[PDB]
Coordinates of C-alpha atoms in Angstrom, one line a residue:
Chain A
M1 CA 181.9 50.3 73.0
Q2 CA 178.5 51.3 74.8
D3 CA 176.0 48.5 74.6
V4 CA 172.6 49.3 72.8
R5 CA 169.0 48.2 73.6
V6 CA 165.4 47.8 71.8
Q7 CA 163.0 50.8 73.0
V8 CA 159.3 49.1 72.5
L9 CA 156.2 49.6 74.1
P10 CA 155.2 46.6 76.1
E11 CA 151.3 46.7 74.6
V12 CA 150.1 49.0 72.1
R13 CA 146.3 49.4 71.6
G14 CA 145.0 49.4 68.1
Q15 CA 142.3 50.5 66.7
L16 CA 139.9 48.0 64.9
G17 CA 139.6 49.3 60.8
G18 CA 142.3 52.0 61.6
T19 CA 146.2 52.4 61.6
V20 CA 148.2 51.5 64.5
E21 CA 151.9 51.9 64.7
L22 CA 154.7 49.4 66.6
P23 CA 157.4 52.0 68.0
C24 CA 160.6 50.2 67.9
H25 CA 163.9 52.1 68.4
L26 CA 167.6 51.1 69.0
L27 CA 169.0 53.2 71.8
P28 CA 171.4 54.8 72.2
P29 CA 173.2 56.1 68.8
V30 CA 176.9 54.3 69.2
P31 CA 179.8 55.5 67.1
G32 CA 181.1 52.4 65.0
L33 CA 177.8 50.3 65.4
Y34 CA 176.1 49.2 62.4
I35 CA 172.5 47.8 62.2
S36 CA 172.9 44.9 59.4
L37 CA 169.1 44.3 59.2
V38 CA 165.6 45.0 61.3
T39 CA 163.2 42.2 61.5
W40 CA 159.8 42.1 62.6
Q41 CA 158.5 38.6 63.9
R42 CA 154.6 37.3 65.2
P43 CA 156.4 34.6 67.2
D44 CA 153.0 33.0 67.9
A45 CA 152.6 32.5 64.2
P46 CA 153.3 29.1 62.3
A47 CA 157.0 29.2 61.4
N48 CA 156.6 30.2 57.8
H49 CA 154.3 33.2 58.8
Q50 CA 156.5 34.2 61.9
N51 CA 159.0 36.8 59.7
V52 CA 156.3 39.5 58.5
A53 CA 158.7 42.3 57.9
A54 CA 162.5 42.8 57.1
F55 CA 164.5 46.2 56.2
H56 CA 167.9 46.1 54.7
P57 CA 170.2 48.9 54.7
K58 CA 170.8 48.7 51.1
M59 CA 168.1 46.8 49.9
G60 CA 165.2 48.3 51.5
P61 CA 162.3 46.5 52.7
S62 CA 160.4 42.9 52.5
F63 CA 157.2 41.7 53.9
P64 CA 157.5 38.1 53.5
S65 CA 154.4 36.6 55.6
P66 CA 150.8 36.8 54.0
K67 CA 150.0 37.9 57.7
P68 CA 149.3 41.0 57.7
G69 CA 151.1 41.1 53.9
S70 CA 153.2 43.6 52.0
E71 CA 149.8 45.7 51.3
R72 CA 149.0 46.6 54.6
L73 CA 152.7 47.0 56.2
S74 CA 155.2 49.7 56.4
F75 CA 158.2 50.9 57.5
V76 CA 157.1 54.8 59.0
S77 CA 160.8 56.2 58.9
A78 CA 163.7 53.3 57.8
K79 CA 165.4 54.6 54.9
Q80 CA 168.2 53.0 52.9
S81 CA 171.6 54.1 52.1
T82 CA 175.6 57.0 52.4
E83 CA 174.7 55.9 55.9
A84 CA 171.8 54.2 55.6
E85 CA 169.0 54.9 59.3
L86 CA 167.7 52.2 60.6
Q87 CA 167.3 53.2 64.2
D88 CA 163.6 53.9 63.9
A89 CA 161.7 50.6 63.0
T90 CA 158.6 51.4 64.0
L91 CA 156.0 49.7 62.1
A92 CA 152.7 50.6 60.6
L93 CA 149.5 48.3 60.0
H94 CA 146.7 49.7 58.1
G95 CA 143.2 48.2 58.0
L96 CA 143.7 46.7 61.4
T97 CA 141.9 43.3 61.7
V98 CA 141.4 41.2 65.2
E99 CA 143.5 38.5 62.9
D100 CA 146.6 41.2 63.2
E101 CA 146.5 41.1 67.3
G102 CA 149.1 39.3 69.3
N103 CA 152.8 39.6 70.1
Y104 CA 155.3 41.2 67.6
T105 CA 158.8 41.2 67.9
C106 CA 161.4 44.0 66.7
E107 CA 164.8 42.8 66.4
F108 CA 168.1 44.9 65.2
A109 CA 170.9 42.7 63.8
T110 CA 173.9 44.6 64.4
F111 CA 177.6 44.4 64.5
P112 CA 179.4 44.2 66.5
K113 CA 177.0 44.0 69.4
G114 CA 175.2 40.9 68.2
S115 CA 171.3 40.7 67.8
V116 CA 168.6 42.9 70.1
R117 CA 165.1 42.6 70.6
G118 CA 162.2 43.9 72.4
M119 CA 158.3 42.6 72.4
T120 CA 155.2 44.2 72.1
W121 CA 151.5 42.9 72.6
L122 CA 149.3 44.3 69.7
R123 CA 145.6 44.1 71.5
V124 CA 142.5 45.2 69.9
Chain B
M1 CA 162.5 31.2 47.2
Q2 CA 162.0 27.8 49.3
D3 CA 162.0 28.4 53.0
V4 CA 165.0 28.6 55.0
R5 CA 165.7 27.0 58.6
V6 CA 168.5 26.2 60.5
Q7 CA 170.2 22.7 61.4
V8 CA 172.2 22.4 65.0
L9 CA 172.6 19.0 67.5
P10 CA 169.9 19.5 69.8
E11 CA 172.5 18.8 72.4
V12 CA 176.2 18.5 72.6
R13 CA 178.7 17.2 75.6
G14 CA 181.8 18.9 75.8
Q15 CA 184.9 18.2 76.9
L16 CA 186.1 20.6 79.9
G17 CA 189.3 22.0 79.3
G18 CA 189.6 21.3 75.7
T19 CA 187.4 22.5 72.6
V20 CA 183.8 21.6 71.7
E21 CA 182.3 22.6 68.1
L22 CA 178.7 23.5 68.1
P23 CA 177.5 22.9 64.4
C24 CA 175.0 25.4 62.6
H25 CA 173.9 25.6 59.3
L26 CA 171.3 27.6 57.0
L27 CA 169.5 25.3 55.2
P28 CA 169.1 24.9 51.9
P29 CA 171.2 26.8 49.8
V30 CA 169.1 29.1 48.0
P31 CA 170.0 32.0 45.4
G32 CA 169.5 35.5 45.9
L33 CA 169.2 34.6 50.0
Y34 CA 171.5 37.4 51.4
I35 CA 172.6 36.3 54.9
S36 CA 173.1 39.8 56.8
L37 CA 174.7 38.3 60.1
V38 CA 174.7 35.6 62.1
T39 CA 174.9 35.7 65.8
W40 CA 175.3 33.5 68.8
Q41 CA 173.7 34.0 71.8
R42 CA 173.1 32.2 75.3
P43 CA 169.6 33.4 76.3
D44 CA 170.0 32.7 79.6
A45 CA 172.6 35.2 80.6
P46 CA 172.1 38.7 82.0
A47 CA 171.7 40.6 78.5
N48 CA 175.2 42.3 78.6
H49 CA 176.4 38.7 77.9
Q50 CA 173.8 37.1 75.9
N51 CA 175.7 38.0 72.6
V52 CA 178.4 35.8 72.6
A53 CA 179.7 35.7 68.8
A54 CA 178.5 37.8 65.8
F55 CA 179.8 37.2 62.2
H56 CA 179.2 40.1 59.2
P57 CA 180.0 39.2 55.6
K58 CA 182.3 42.6 55.2
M59 CA 183.5 43.0 58.9
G60 CA 184.1 39.3 60.2
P61 CA 183.5 38.0 63.6
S62 CA 183.1 39.9 67.0
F63 CA 182.3 38.7 70.4
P64 CA 180.7 40.9 71.9
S65 CA 180.5 39.3 75.7
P66 CA 183.8 39.3 77.6
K67 CA 182.5 35.9 78.6
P68 CA 183.7 33.4 76.8
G69 CA 184.9 36.3 75.2
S70 CA 186.9 36.1 71.6
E71 CA 190.0 34.3 73.3
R72 CA 187.8 31.1 74.0
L73 CA 185.6 31.7 70.7
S74 CA 185.8 31.2 67.3
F75 CA 183.7 30.5 64.2
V76 CA 185.3 27.5 62.5
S77 CA 184.1 27.7 58.9
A78 CA 182.5 31.4 58.5
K79 CA 184.6 33.5 55.7
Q80 CA 184.6 37.4 55.3
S81 CA 184.6 39.1 51.7
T82 CA 184.8 39.1 47.2
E83 CA 182.3 36.5 48.3
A84 CA 181.1 35.9 52.1
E85 CA 180.3 32.6 52.9
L86 CA 178.2 32.3 56.1
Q87 CA 175.8 29.7 55.4
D88 CA 178.0 27.9 58.0
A89 CA 178.0 29.2 61.7
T90 CA 179.4 26.7 63.5
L91 CA 181.3 28.3 66.5
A92 CA 184.0 26.6 68.8
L93 CA 184.8 27.2 72.3
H94 CA 188.0 26.6 73.8
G95 CA 189.3 25.8 77.5
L96 CA 185.5 24.8 78.2
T97 CA 184.7 25.6 81.6
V98 CA 181.4 25.0 83.3
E99 CA 180.5 28.4 83.1
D100 CA 180.1 27.9 79.3
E101 CA 177.2 25.1 79.9
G102 CA 173.8 25.9 79.1
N103 CA 171.8 26.9 76.0
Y104 CA 173.0 28.7 73.0
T105 CA 170.8 29.9 70.4
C106 CA 172.6 30.6 66.6
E107 CA 170.5 33.0 64.4
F108 CA 170.7 33.9 60.7
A109 CA 169.6 37.5 60.0
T110 CA 168.6 37.2 56.2
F111 CA 166.7 39.1 53.4
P112 CA 164.2 38.9 52.2
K113 CA 163.2 36.4 54.4
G114 CA 164.2 37.6 57.9
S115 CA 165.4 35.9 60.9
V116 CA 165.7 32.2 61.6
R117 CA 167.2 30.7 64.9
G118 CA 168.1 27.1 66.4
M119 CA 168.7 26.1 69.9
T120 CA 171.5 23.7 71.2
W121 CA 172.2 22.8 75.0
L122 CA 175.8 22.4 76.0
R123 CA 176.5 19.9 78.6
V124 CA 179.1 17.9 80.2

């Protein structure tokens, strides 16, 4: 089986007050490869605020942290299930504030290949 | 729902030629927490070899890297569905080699809480 890798931008410049997207995609599509979960983290947050977004192929989205929080986050293209489509894990952040800045990591938990991640610096 | 984290040993001394176990548990138990995948990684390896083992609740184990490889790795207690039990992700390496030494990370991809990981240094 072909290996998969995460494609993200190394830096995204966001406009304060507005909306910004953090593109994230798993490539290439590979037969026999399942995406079990997608997660976004802010690795520089305190541990209980590091997981900021997760998307499960049956259960859909969860935004477990207050920062940036549920009301301002969305998965632009992730679809629950026959076959769920999680290869585009692009995240959007509305009402962008200075407190939203910093590193974000997009990770795909896949089987059988395991977990793969990419990192983006959101600069404001 | 309580916050979770990963319990591992900081360091493990292993018997060259023999078997070593790297314990890993997700704690505390929390009802309604779904464990989507467990993975073990060697973050210092080249990315084709970083993911060394994975366990999916329906699909069972996989050993994506040829090194250590499936012939030498097993999950000691993880069980696949019926109810999967992935909260104990303890990994056994068999026929331990010098090339196996280094940093190991055990990660749980969970929903709704996201991903959490603990690290163990394997030495001789």
